[PDB]
Amino acid sequence: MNTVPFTSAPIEVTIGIDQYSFNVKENQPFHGIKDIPIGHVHVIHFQHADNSSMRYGYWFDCRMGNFYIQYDPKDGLYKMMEERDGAKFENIVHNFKERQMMVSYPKIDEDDTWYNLTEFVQMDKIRKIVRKDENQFSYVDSSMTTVQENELSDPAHSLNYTVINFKSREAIRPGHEMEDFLDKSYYLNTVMLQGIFKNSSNYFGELQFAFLNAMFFGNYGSSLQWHAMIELICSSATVPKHMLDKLDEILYYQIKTLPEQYSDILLNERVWNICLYSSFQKNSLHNTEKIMENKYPELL
């Protein structure tokens, strides 16, 4: 179990750690988060009490280094940093724990939610979508745009998700125009899975990362990406059986975890009604269809 200490909390802020969150008052004696489960990526995220504009946060994996948070009064945000002095860090953390100034990552033992949401998400793949190679952790916020969004303006601060576009030469084989547009299996299996992602685990990892950035930061380009990757599978007549079974599980836990009050902006009606009711895979997402129908029948 690992720890992310905070130097201090000089401004009132709601702090999230994965799906949990807590309020910290201005200059409240808060020194971090302990008992973070090893084996998963994590996200620590922030919303200032004064400026609900810009949710922002940091993807990290405590196996890759010792990380801590420190407020920067010039740039006006909580920044993640790496502590390279291992003994300084252990000593800092042990003092804060002794004084009990840390919140405990509040995982219930039966609860597999975070595993289920991050099953295929790897830090190494996050760092290729979020390019900032001098850090082991990745910053994301509500306003960052995607590479594909920039094609339709600062590249260093982009989300470099795999571009999917159903009306493109990559997606459509010359002479198979109708076949490939109505049955996207070629584009899914040959172009994306065999060509770009190499396997379905990497595909699912980007899909899950896109959902999590959409949910936690309201990142609109991430929401677009999550829906496109769903739609590309459901609009393929030919999908490995193991992928369809895993997709139903993945989406089930995403819909389960989504705040009820955010469904209006975060779920695209067309994609979901097409996927659950019109597409080739309309009959292959039983768990997802049942939770959607009991939790968001309005959308459908």
Q: How far apart are CA 32 and CA 16, in angstroms?
A: 11
Residue list 73-92, contact with another protein (CB under 8 A): none
Element housing 24 (H / E): strand 20-24
Does 169 sit near another protein (CB under 8 A)?
Answer: yes
State the nearest-atom distance from the C-beta of 171 to another protein, in Å: 9
State the nearest-atom distance from the C-beta of 181 to another protein, in Å: 5
Does 156 sit near another protein (CB under 8 A)?
Answer: no
Q: How far apart are CA 181 and CA 183, in angstroms?
A: 6
Does 269 sit near another protein (CB under 8 A)?
Answer: no
State the nearest-atom distance from the C-beta of 170 to another protein, in Å: 10
Beta bridge partners of 36: 2
Neighbours of 61 (CB within 10 A): 20
Interface with another protein (CB under 8 A), residue from 50, 177, 264, 269: 177
Q: How far apart are CA 82 and CA 14, in angstroms?
A: 22
State the nearest-atom distance from the C-beta of 173 to another protein, in Å: 11
User: Which of 7, 165 has the CB closer to another protein?
Assistant: 165
How would you classify the pairing of strands 103-104 and 32-36? parallel
Interface with another protein (CB under 8 A), residue from 27, 95, 104, 168: 168
User: Which of 167, 242 has the CB closer to another protein?
Assistant: 167
State the nearest-atom distance from the C-beta of 122 to another protein, in Å: 34
Does 243 sit near another protein (CB under 8 A)?
Answer: no
Beta bridge partners of 268: none
122-136 per-residue burial string, b: 16 or more CB within 10 A, e: under 16: ebebbbebbeeeebb
User: Which of 61, 180 has the CB closer to another protein?
Assistant: 180
The widest CA-to-CA distance across the chain, in whole angstroms, is: 70
Does 178 sit near another protein (CB under 8 A)?
Answer: yes
CA nearest to 192, candidates 228, 221, 222, 224: 228
Q: Would you tell me which residues interact with another protein (CB under 8 A)?
A: 167-169, 172, 177-178, 181
